[PDB]
Amino acid sequence: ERIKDISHRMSIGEAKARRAKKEMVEANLRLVISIAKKYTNRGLQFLDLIQ
């Protein structure tokens, strides 16, 4: 019972942190693009710089 409770609490915490981190990343994708716009034509393509 105790290990099951600990596992459920840990899984919930990791899921919540992962969701929040995903929200932040999806919000700032546009900042990533704005930064990567300035390093084109240096051997890498635009999408590689974005990733």
CB 26 to DNA: min, Å: 25
CA-closest candidate to residue 50, choices 3, 5, 34: 34
Region for 40 from its dihedrals, namely left if φ exceeds 0, alpha if ψ lies in -120 to 50, beta otherwise: beta
- Write out the two tokens for 48: 């590689």
C-beta closer to DNA: residue 1 or 51: 51
Q: Which of residues 1-51 bind DNA (CB under 7 A)?
A: 40-42
CB 41 to DNA: min, Å: 3
In the complex, the residues that contact DNA under the rule CB under 7 A are: 40-42
